[PDB]
Amino acid sequence: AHIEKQAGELQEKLIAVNRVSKTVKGGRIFSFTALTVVGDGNGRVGFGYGKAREVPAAIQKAMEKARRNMINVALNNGTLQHPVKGVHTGSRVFMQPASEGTGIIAGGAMRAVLEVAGVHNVLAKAYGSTNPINVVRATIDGLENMNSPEMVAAKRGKSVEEILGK
Amino acid sequence: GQKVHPNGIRLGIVKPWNSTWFANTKEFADNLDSDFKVRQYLTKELAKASVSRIVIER
Amino acid sequence: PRRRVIGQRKILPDPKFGSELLAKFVNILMVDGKKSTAESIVYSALETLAQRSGKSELEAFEVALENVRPTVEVKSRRVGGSTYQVPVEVRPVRRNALAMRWIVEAARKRGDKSMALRLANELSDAAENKGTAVKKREDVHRMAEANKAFAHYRWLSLRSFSHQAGASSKQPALGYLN
Amino acid sequence: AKAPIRARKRVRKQVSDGVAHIHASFNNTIVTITDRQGNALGWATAGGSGFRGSRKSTPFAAQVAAERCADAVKEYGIKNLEVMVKGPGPGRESTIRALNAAGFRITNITDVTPIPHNGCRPPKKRRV
Amino acid sequence: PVIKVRENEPFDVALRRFKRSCEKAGVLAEVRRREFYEKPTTERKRAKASAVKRHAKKLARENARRTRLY
Amino acid sequence: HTLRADIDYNTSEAHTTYGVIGVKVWIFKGEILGGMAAVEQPEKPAAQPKKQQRKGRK
RNA sequence: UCGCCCCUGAA
RNA sequence: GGCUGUCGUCAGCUCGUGUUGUGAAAUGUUGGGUUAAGUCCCGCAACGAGCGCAACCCUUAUCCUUUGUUGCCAGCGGUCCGGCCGGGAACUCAAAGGAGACUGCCAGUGAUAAACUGGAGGAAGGUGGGGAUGACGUCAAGUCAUCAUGGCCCUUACGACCAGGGCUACACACGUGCUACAAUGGCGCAUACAAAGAGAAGCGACCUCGCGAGAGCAAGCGGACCUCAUAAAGUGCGUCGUAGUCCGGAUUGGAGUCUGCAACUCGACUCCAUGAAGUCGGAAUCGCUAGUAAUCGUGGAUCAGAAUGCCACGGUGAAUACGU
RNA sequence: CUUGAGUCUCGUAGAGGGGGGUAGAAUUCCAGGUGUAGCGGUGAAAUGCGUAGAGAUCUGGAGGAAUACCGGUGGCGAAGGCGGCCCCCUGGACGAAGACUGACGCUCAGGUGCGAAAGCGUGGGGAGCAAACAGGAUUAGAUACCCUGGUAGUCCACGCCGUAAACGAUGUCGACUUGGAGGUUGUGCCCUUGAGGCGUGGCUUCCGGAGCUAACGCGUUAAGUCGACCGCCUGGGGAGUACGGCCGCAAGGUUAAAACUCAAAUGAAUUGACGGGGGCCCGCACAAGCGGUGGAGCAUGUGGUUUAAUUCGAUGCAACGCGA
């Protein structure tokens, strides 16, 4: 994709951070992996999974890859414009728009991912097994998938032209 | 053990010796001991400069 | 597991036969890696043979040994399809080795003074098959010709036979013997 | 090999022809030459040759038995075979070939072999 | 392992190992073992699995055939 | 294992209250140039067909 | 084809 | 901590970047050929790169170059006939430096690729042979006793020093070696050739004495000088005759030696006597594919003074390998 | 009203169901003949069977059970399930023109019927195989797998029980949504001038797109996208057990808990590891050879034991002539 870490407006942030393992021929190795997001407070948000032998380069590489998995989002107000109740992976995702005068209200991944993405008055919820790692798939289920007033308005405008043409 | 440290001829005719001297028949022992002793006190009393390595030529 | 050809030994001609075959008969009669002490007995026993028998210098060994060597040696390997150990028809080179070895073995079953006199008299009785070193032959060759199930490993081999054209009886094995 | 010799007391049952029965069993090999009047002349088997184990069904074991049998029919004067190969084990051309190479020739290849239509139920046999 | 059809010509070794293929196919080897209806029928469906896959293999093979690596 | 390169190697050790921490620093300064496999003078082949001898006869 | 079991724990 | 063993001299082990997967991860590194080799070639979402293999380093198999003394001796002389002296540097030798081997070349085979099989030239062909080379790691493997060090403990002591004793007890068991059980040998005679190291707390020629070990006398030597050093198996002869012996050598006693301040438990060597078990070893189990095995000596370190050990050096010198 | 459903007509194919006849092969028994010292089994064996004549082989007769090939993801049925051949009675499916009925439909707790195999009752039948059982074998033991026999049973008739990993682990019905290849069965068309060329329906495999899924995969015959109705689940162990009811002749089946106890149980997939899993490739790993050790003595270490001390550490290989 394209950069989401941009001078004078960058909004670096992290999500997960942990270690994972592979069982090698000898002993067992540890790969320092982590999820990140850089925002701008205006959308443009992504995610990356680094692999490293150290925690700093785990976040380095994950923010490289964050820019390579940027998704665009555009909105008005401090809240998302459309509810998306879609589910990606086995973590169940829900997402309402909500009037200003309320917080993010979420302790999971979607506390921080729903901050960087220019939203902070959104109300969201999740069901199913607790697992922050795929709460992050609310990139798919709300930011990537959306509707906007001028999208729906051009449905109503497309139809009129066809009747005239015949 | 895990690393056996191969350096025993990397500092041979591949890179210079770090204490080049000669000794005769009954001098072998003496020259050995005397050199090493000096270096202990030397390296300790100097720490205001960044030691690349002491060497001696006898 | 074995890569490339085996070694070959180039050895000297004898100073009384010119042979490398009967140089290999000094080699068998070496002990403690001494060819010196070996060569003694060899010639000492050559003479013993010449007196006690007719023959020739290349018949005192040769002919006598061609009555000690079997043409089949039975080796070992657990597989056989009956837990059998298979006959192996030996190459003419390995024929030599067997008989040569056995004649020296036979002189350690004797105590008839020296070592020359031992193997000499033995070789004199070994050309008419009335020795005791020719009776070693009569167990290797007796076995082999009275019992066979060949070099096939019967269960493994049979599957291979069936696939190729349909058989259960002996043929080349197309499939694995693994 | 090690197979016994055989002989018979009659030389009056010949017709110059006889069925070569072969039962190439997975655990044995029987070779029996019956006359073409359907009355025995000779018989022989691998176990009587002296073989034991599963080396009673082997090619070698089948040959020896075919030749033991040959000694038991020679005195009548027989020189034609009506080969009846049967059973699943080896020895199924071992016997044939041996006979040919023993002053007989083949004349007929016939099939008399049990083929069930499942009027009896098989055993389980081996399972180790 | 043979059929009733005869060979009347001189032989020491004759063709009778494709009279094996006109009789035996394991039909004298099923007399010492019991099976369920399930067992042999599933095996038949591995010889028609062979035949459908035969077509599929040819597409894969064609790419390899282009280049020389043998 | 390069025999045509200047393989450096020295050690240090700390002696902290956390235990002892060994240090090993291996710098591969050369890569195709020695320091005693290069820059040296051998001697002989002097290329003279006569090997001098004492003369006179007695 | 030659049966053949049994094995306290955190690096 | 440092050091080391270990699988393993294993051909493996990773990583960056991209792509694939929600992820763990994967790809690469897999496949088709091939090599000792993640070796090389081709292909394939892989493209590159690092470590290990290999690589470059030593040494040896040849031939050349220097230098010729304490080493060599042909052509040249002495002779004392001995490289002992002059002469000659040719030769061997030493040991510094080069020449060389790379599937380089020839043919076939192999995708026309790598490679494989024969061939040639050569001292040597196909990782030439042997060293160094022993990865990243795993085993909380060992080692606080080589040394280093966090904590802990001892403080007219657990510290320190000395004389005596114990480490070499002992009724046994196990591991690793060595020596025999013999004529291919033993013993007696005579006789053949070594290499590589060692050395003024040393080795010690010579000559004298001692059965000997060794002692006295003393030259030489820090040295291709001199000495240890007489190599030993081997070899030509004398014998003995298959016996527990002319095999074998344990045990003990007495008599001596040496090195030491002093050799009693607890030094080694020698002399004479005594003369062992063993007549060639079950179940089982281990090493080894060539200058190796086998066997025979020699030297070295440690060492005032103790090698069947370790470490190293040469002599003689195989059997067998169808085949996995 | 006809698009849903149903009927009529005409054909089509099939192991659909039930009943009754009929053929041969094979095993077995019995009888006769021939021939003689073995047979049979196994990795080896043994029990068992044979001179009172077996095994094999041939001829005659009899009986029971099952129908080689056929034969295939081939076919049919609601499912369970259903195979030689023929007749009789009888069910379902599908297609083709039309013709007719006119939502008459869909599903379903209860209820009712159908139920592989074993089992049970009653009566027939009994060859082979085989629980049980008895010898033998393997094993330390082997009440087993293995071998030799062998009873109930399997088989037939009737009734009963109603279970099964009763499976596509996938409720049934209706509706939709890319396709490709094969199989099978109707029917229309095309010089049918080609066993076929082009369609269009029914059924059936394999592949796979989108989509779905946590993934494996499913994938127009869905686990896709919808609706209708019913059934079930709501942590695991406790337990498909107890208790009561119900059903059964019984065996049991059916309905179906709780106390108590635990922080997991579990599914799919990833990498390595292991496999008496497979394939591939090497090494004195084996085969083939050569030489040892364990026997004996001595040398050396260790354990055990003893001692005032036998200073300490190492522990298959990788400790135990090791540190020393």
Task: Give the CATH number for residue C81.
Answer: 1.10.455.10
Q: Is D123 on the interface with E (CB under 8 A)?
A: yes
* D117 vs E: CB within 8 A: no
C135 lies in which domain range? 20-143
Task: Please tell me what resolution, in angstroms, this structure has.
Answer: 7.1
State the residue for tokens 């896959």: E53
Cβ contacts of C165 within 8 Å, gap of 6 or more: E17, E18, E21
Nucleotide nearest to A140 (CA to C1'): H22
Phi and psi based region of residue B5 (left: phi greater than 0; alpha: psi -120 to 50; beta: remaining): left
Dihedral angle of Cα A154, A157, A158, A159, to the nearest 10 degrees: 130
How many whole angstroms separate alpha carbon A127 and alpha carbon A94? Answer: 8
What is the spatial distance between Cα B10 and Cα E48, in angstroms, rounded to a whole number?
67
Q: Quick check: C137 and C69 in contact, CB under 8 A?
A: yes
Burial class of residue D59 (count of CB atoms within 10 Å of its CB; 0-12, 13-18, 19+): buried
Q: F6, F36 in Cβ contact below 8 A?
A: no
Q: How would DSSP label each residue in A45-73? A: B-------SSSTHHHHHHHHTTTTS-B--
Cα-flanking dihedrals φ and ψ of residue C87, to 5°? -55, 150
Eight-class DSSP state of A134 = G
Strand H contact residues in chain C (11-70), C-beta within 7 Å: 11, 24, 27-38, 40-41
The residue whose two tokens read 């099976």 is E35
Please state, in angstroms and as integers, the Cα–Cα distance from residue F13 to each residue in B7, F7, F16, following that order.
19, 20, 9
Whether there are 3 or more C-beta pairs closer than 8 Å between F and B is: yes
E6 within 8 A of D108, measured Cβ to Cβ: yes
Q: Using CB atoms within 10 A of its CB, is residue C117 exposed (0-12), middle (13-18) or buried (19+)? A: middle
CA dist list (Å): C80 to C76, C146, C150, D26, D57: 10, 17, 8, 15, 13
Query: Which chain B residue has the Cα nearest residue F4?
Result: B14
Compute CA E50 distance to the chain's CA centroid, rounded to the nearest angstrom. Answer: 12
Structure tokens at F52: 């001098």
DSSP annotation string for A77-111? TTS-SS------SSSEEEEE---SSS----SSGGG
Given a contact cutoff of 8 angstroms between Cβ atoms, the answer to whether C170 and C150 are in contact is yes
Residue B16 contacts F where some CB pair is shorter than 8 Å: yes
Query: Which of E15, E16, E17, E28 has the most C C-beta neighbours within 10 Å, making it the best mutation to test the interface with C?
Result: E17
Joined together, the tokens standing for residue D81 give 């075979």
Please give the helix or strand (H or E) that residue A152 lies within, else none: helix A149-152
Residues 6+ apart with CB under 8 A from D34: D18, D19, D21, D40, D41
Separation between the CA of C33 and the C1’ of H225 (whole angstroms): 39
Distances in whole angstroms, Cα of residue E27 to Cα of each of B31, D116, F55: 94, 9, 108
Residues 6+ away with beta carbon under 8 Å from A34: A14, A15, A16, A17, A18, A49, A50, A55, A58, A59, A62
How buried is residue C161: exposed, middle or buried, by Cβ count under 10 Å (0-12/13-18/19+)?
A: buried
- Interface partners of chain F (CB pairs < 8 Å, 3 or more) are B
CA B42, CA A129: separation in Å to the nearest integer? 66
Cβ(F9)–Cβ(B7) under 8 Å?
Answer: yes
- Elucidation technique: cryo-EM
